[PDB]
Amino acid sequence: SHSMRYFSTSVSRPGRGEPRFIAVGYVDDTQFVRFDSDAASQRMEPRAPWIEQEGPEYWDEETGKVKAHSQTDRENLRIALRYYNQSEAGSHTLQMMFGCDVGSDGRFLRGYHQYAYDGKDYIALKEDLRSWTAADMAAQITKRKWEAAHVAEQQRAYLEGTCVDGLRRYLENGKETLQRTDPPKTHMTHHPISDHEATLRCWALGFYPAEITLTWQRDGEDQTQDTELVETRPAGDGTFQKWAAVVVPSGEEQRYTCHVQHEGLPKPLTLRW
Amino acid sequence: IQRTPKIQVYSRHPAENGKSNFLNCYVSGFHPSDIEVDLLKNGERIEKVEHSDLSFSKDWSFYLLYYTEFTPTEKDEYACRVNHVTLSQPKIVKWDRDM
Amino acid sequence: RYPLTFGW
Amino acid sequence: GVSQDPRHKITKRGQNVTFRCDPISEHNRLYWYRQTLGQGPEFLTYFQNEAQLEKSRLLSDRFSAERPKGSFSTLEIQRTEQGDSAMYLCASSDRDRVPETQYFGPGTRLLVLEDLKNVFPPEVAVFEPSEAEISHTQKATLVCLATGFYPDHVELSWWVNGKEVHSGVCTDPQPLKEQPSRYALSSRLRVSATFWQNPRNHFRCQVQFYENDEWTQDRAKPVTQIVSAEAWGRA
Amino acid sequence: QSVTQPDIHITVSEGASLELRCNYSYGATPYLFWYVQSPGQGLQLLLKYFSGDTLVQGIKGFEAEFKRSQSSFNLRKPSVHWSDAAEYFCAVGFTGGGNKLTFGTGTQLKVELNIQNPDPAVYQLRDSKSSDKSVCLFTDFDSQTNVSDSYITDKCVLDMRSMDFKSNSAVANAFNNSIIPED
């Protein structure tokens, strides 16, 4: 299963020019396009090697649509101020995300569409892709406008159509990179903090995709007390990192085991010191 | 609402003295978007610094990655400095070599 | 491909 | 509902031309199209109320389009060549209607020539019906002629008693060449015999033909003009 | 892309059923349009569908049906009028590749009249006081009549809406080049 996402962000700046607009395009775990409103190019810029195969006609259409998005979301902010009766000299953030998920067959699986204003949900498309969910009364005014127009089936036509149709093209063009999984590299360290207490930190590096499960077990029993786990973090080269640490008494390190589960590993590895 | 940024400092590859590597400062789960991140070498800012494009997670919390090219040594100190509205004062997170 | 977008 | 200006423009090769479009109120999008003679329109560029979003990469930088105040759009083409002679269309939409209907204007038809050595205004005359038709059909058929005009940029109409009438009016859909080289066009108006046998009624044939241009010939300047011929009732 | 109009030219008699087809590229759920264009002025919107409802009624009695299984959006009219002679374009909007319209190849339509009571004749109209030419009018002739020295014009139809009477016309021993019946 693979997915594609599109994220947009509009940040208002009173007196500092037009609001900053940043839009990015994401495959399941790989960014491939970008657009910055303050950049000199003012064009949809590629951020992946395989996406450069697209012809100039592709970039002309993509640039025109995203630039239309910035103007639409700039006009959107002024409407949001009067809808909520806010100060015209204040700064706010407008967010948006929607994409499509495909299956092993390349079949349509799920569709999403959500807007957000100042970190809270504003309007969202339901799972049926033909009805809306207004979070507050202000969004119901927009919902009424988006119900007078048949916006539901246009996004549904895109989500089941152009989104999926273009996603298979993106995967096929760069199957050498996106469709393959890099297995994690696993090792363990040792860090004593006193004469009878030590910290065992299980390391997993260079995996793709980023979804991975690390479980520290003691004598076959999972442990959460005295365990520190950090969120998955990107390496910048297309891989991700994650470690889990546990403080153990000295002389009992051989009892503890580390288990790492990942898609790239056919069998979940077991690591013991 | 406002969200406290999460700061992690790490290296792309395992640290080996004398060999080039990349230092990453991952700021995630923060709100609002406007934030200031600098990479420091022995308390001095690094000029050649690049960052990823702005994005956000499911909970609408933004996340960014700042990276630069460097060569670690035994005694040189590298740290990430982040200034955010939710932080009353700028916060510095030191890089642990084998964090 | 980038989708269409509508105002409020 | 979209209004354009001008409808017809004639210019020499290698000069500057400029067209203006006035779309419908409260519509925030504007599309530009180029339609060649007897062919589908070609996309040129389109705006959303502030700036140029997409341009047909085929059309070069010398094609300048702008919508400064978000109300009217301007199209400027420099270094004109005979390959640019086509009808240029202006369309506007709402961006908030999901079908996204684009409404087009009357358009602007452009003619690019190597030199202004062919301009000629027409001559207009009206011919009264014969009694043989009236005695046999009880109807009167009038004929108007447009002789010696160039190019075929005309807009002919009939007027009865100062009011335009369309019933019983026929006109050639396209002009013809007298030397297949001025053009020729014909039109007809048919009314009942009682309307013609009354001397009070008035008939007029209007032929609208399409200031800063230079005229170097020793004759009247063939500017946009109305050449009219009139006829009255007869007993 | 690749909008196709198979019918590139159709000439029918007045009062007959009319269908003009329009196909898209098998995979899009796009905006659909049909525009008419007289030789003089620009385009007039007839119908549009994206909507939801398969079969759509438009202006001038024109209606269109959308068949996703066939990817066709065909213009229809139960009885065509004599004034419908114009070029008909179907426009599509591929929502994924921008909201610009992709026009079709264009269909040129002509309608000739189903004349009921023919009565061809040639008359010489009175010359004007500002002209030196004599004019001849070939009118009330059958639709299938073909009109062939260093001028003879093509035929056009006039409709007197008051009397519901329609007849043809021609503008010019004048019509010797053309074939005319003995009557």
Please give the angle made by the CA atoms of B36, B37 and B38, to the nearest 5 degrees. Answer: 125
In this complex, do D53 and A64 lie within 8 Å of one another by their Cβ atoms?
Answer: yes
In this structure, which amino acid lies at residue D175? P
Task: Tell me how far apart the alpha carbons of residues E98 and A61 are, in angstroms, rounded to a whole number.
Answer: 6
In this structure, which amino acid lies at residue B78? Y
> DSSP string of A196-255?
SEEEEEEEEEEEBSS-EEEEEEETTEE--TTEEEPPPEE-SSS-EEEEEEEEEETT-GGG
Structural domain boundaries, residue B78: 1-99
Of A68, A151, A153, the CB nearest to D48: A68
User: Which runs of E-coded beta strand occur in chain A?
Assistant: 2-11, 20-27, 30-36, 45-46, 93-97, 100-102, 108-111, 114-117, 120-125, 132-134, 185-188, 191-192, 197-207, 212-218, 221-222, 227-229, 233-234, 240-249, 256-262, 269-272
- D132 interfacial to chain E (CB closer than 8 Å): yes
Q: Are E45 and E31 in contact (CB under 8 A)?
A: no
Task: Tell me how far apart the alpha carbons of residues A56 and D57 are, in angstroms, rounded to a whole number.
Answer: 8
Min Cα–Cα distance to chain D from E169, Å: 8
Please name the CATH architecture into which domain A185-272 falls.
Sandwich (2.60)
H-only helix segments in chain D? 131-137, 193-196
- Separation in Å, CA D147 to CA A24, A221, D88, E163, E177: 64, 104, 28, 32, 22
In this complex, do A150 and D53 lie within 8 Å of one another by their Cβ atoms?
Answer: no
Instruction: Copy the structure tokens of residue E59.
Output: 């202006």
Please give the angle made by the CA atoms of D9, D13 and D18, to the nearest 5 degrees. Answer: 40
User: Domain A2-179 falls in which CATH fold?
Assistant: 3.30.500
Helix (H) or strand (E) holding D34: strand D30-35
3-state secondary structure of E14: coil
Q: For residue A83, which residues of chain C lie inside 8 Å, CB to CB?
A: 8
Min Cα–Cα distance to chain B from A37, Å: 12
User: Which runs of E-coded beta strand occur in D61-182?
Assistant: 63-66, 73-77, 87-92, 103-104, 108-113, 123-127, 139-149, 154-160, 163-164, 169-171, 176-177
Q: Are D209 and D153 in contact (CB under 8 A)?
A: yes
Q: State how many domains chain B has.
A: 1
- Separation in Å, CA E145 to CA B29, E14, E136, E183: 82, 16, 17, 13
Instruction: Copy the structure tokens of residue E142.
Output: 């059958």
Please give the angle made by the CA atoms of A10, A15 and A21, to the nearest 5 degrees. Answer: 15
Task: Tell me how far apart the alpha carbons of residues E159 and E179 are, in angstroms, rounded to a whole number.
Answer: 25
- A79 interfacial to chain C (CB closer than 8 Å): yes
Q: For residue E96, which residues of chain C lie inside 8 Å, CB to CB?
A: 1, 3
Task: Tell me how far apart the alpha carbons of residues A70 and A89 are, in angstroms, rounded to a whole number.
Answer: 20
Instruction: Copy the structure tokens of residue A160.
Output: 């089941």
Of A10, A42, A18, the residue nearest D52 (C-alpha): A42
In this structure, which amino acid lies at residue A1? S
Task: Tell me how far apart the alpha carbons of residues E132 and E128 are, in angstroms, rounded to a whole number.
Answer: 8
Interface residues of C toward A, Cβ cutoff 8 Å, are 1-8
Sketch the domain layout of chain A as residue ranges: 2-179, 185-272
Q: For residue A63, which residues of chain D lie inside 8 Å, CB to CB?
A: 53-54
Task: Tell me how far apart the alpha carbons of residues A71 and A84 are, in angstroms, rounded to a whole number.
Answer: 20
Of D196, D209, D205, D197, the residue nearest D228 (C-alpha): D205
HSE (side-chain half, CA atoms, 13 Å) at D147: 17
- Kindly report the backbone phi and psi dihedral angles of residue D72, in degrees, each rounded to the nearest multiple of 5, phi listed first: -120, 150
Q: Are A71 and D47 in contact (CB under 8 A)?
A: no
Instruction: Copy the structure tokens of residue E41.
Output: 């002025």
Q: Are D188 and D167 in contact (CB under 8 A)?
A: no
- State the DSSP code for E153: P
Of B32, E100, E65, D174, the residue nearest A60 (C-alpha): E100
Alpha-carbon torsion (A131, A133, A137, A138), positive or negative: negative
- D97 interfacial to chain A (CB closer than 8 Å): yes
Rounding to the nearest 10 degrees, give the CA dihedral for residues A220, A222, A228, A231: 110
Q: Are D126 and D231 in contact (CB under 8 A)?
A: yes
Task: Tell me how far apart the alpha carbons of residues D42 and D56 are, in angstroms, rounded to a whole number.
Answer: 9
- CB D119: neighbour CB atoms within 10 A? 16
- Separation in Å, CA A137 to CA A140, A141, A149, D67: 5, 7, 19, 36
3-state secondary structure of A22: strand
HSE (side-chain half, CA atoms, 13 Å) at A149: 20
In this complex, do E28 and A161 lie within 8 Å of one another by their Cβ atoms?
Answer: yes
Instruction: Copy the structure tokens of residue D186.
Output: 């014909």
Mutate: best of A6, A63, A147, A165, partner C, most C CBs <10 A? A6
Task: Tell me how far apart the alpha carbons of residues E24 and E31 are, in angstroms, rounded to a whole number.
Answer: 11
